[PDB]
């Protein structure tokens, strides 16, 4: 029953969504951060200045060494660890134990995070992205392999809404669970199975299209990332974006270094003028060749708490991260090579505005080949 996954994500706002996870035998707890970003279980391993608890293979009957080290350097840091596998559920998941490789994390830069409350991720993307190489076999895939558990996920982020703000959140596996959104569920297609790619179609800020080649929108690449706080937009489209924003809420403006994500803004109980900034609406290729969808995001949605900018500028493609998922239901339907989207039961709305899944809308070649 997806009842008893409902709830299942907890973390602190910005820091990520984490799942309970035990991993080995006896379980040993840990809480999991949830990454459609990402391709690889790995868990820390060994002590850490971050880290209160952490897995040990060695406690662990039903360990087995892969004897196989990998290495994953990224942009931000790093992490480093060993290969193997062992026995993994998830409490507040489905009822069952899968062997599943683990990265057991012994060294890490900048990757782990203070006060976070989670000791690992769990990557959710595909084989192609994996590190060392596509042949280590990712969590959901195993899950899917050894148990009877529908190729799908779905997650409902809901954010924080009225230190760090805590979160909440559901991550329903093998399954849609309908109690979650209201109105129906729009798919685009995943365009190709690695990341969770999809191409967005036209981007409009309070109504007014950016009027982008939508090739743009999708340079090189838009993704679904949950391990991802902001929206992340190409740099032409972010300056294009900020720029409208900007415009929208000339009624009094900020200091450029809230614009870039650095600075905060400050108003006191419940005077945000959210009415000041516009809404921004994606449109996402539909799986009908010329027709699509749209998802808007409020106010509400991309300044998170006094709140930062959530939307930032980006070098490899946009990224529809946290801030734009809490708005939705968003089922990843890996069986179907689709994405749907459908307004959450749970995203934070004035007496105005709403987030909204909308479609469909015609057109009369967005894709940045690779
Ligand atoms: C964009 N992204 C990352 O950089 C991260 C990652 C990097 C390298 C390997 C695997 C995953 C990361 C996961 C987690 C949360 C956040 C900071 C840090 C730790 C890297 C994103 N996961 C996402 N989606």
New binding site residues.
Partial sequence: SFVEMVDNLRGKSGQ?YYVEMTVGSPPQTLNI?V?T??S?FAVGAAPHPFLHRYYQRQLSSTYRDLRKGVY?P?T?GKWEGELGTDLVSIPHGPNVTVRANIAAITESDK?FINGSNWEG?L?LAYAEIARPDDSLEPFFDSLVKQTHVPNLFSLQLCGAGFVLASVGGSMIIGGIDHSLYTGSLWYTPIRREWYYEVIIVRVEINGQDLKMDCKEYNYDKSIV?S??TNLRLPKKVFEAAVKSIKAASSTEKFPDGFWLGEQLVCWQAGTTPWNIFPVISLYLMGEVTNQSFRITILPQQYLRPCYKFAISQSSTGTVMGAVIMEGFYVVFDRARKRIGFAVSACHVHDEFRTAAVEGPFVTLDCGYNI
């Fill in positions: 990520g951060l990454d970003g990402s690889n994953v990224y931000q990757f991720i990557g990332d391990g991802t």
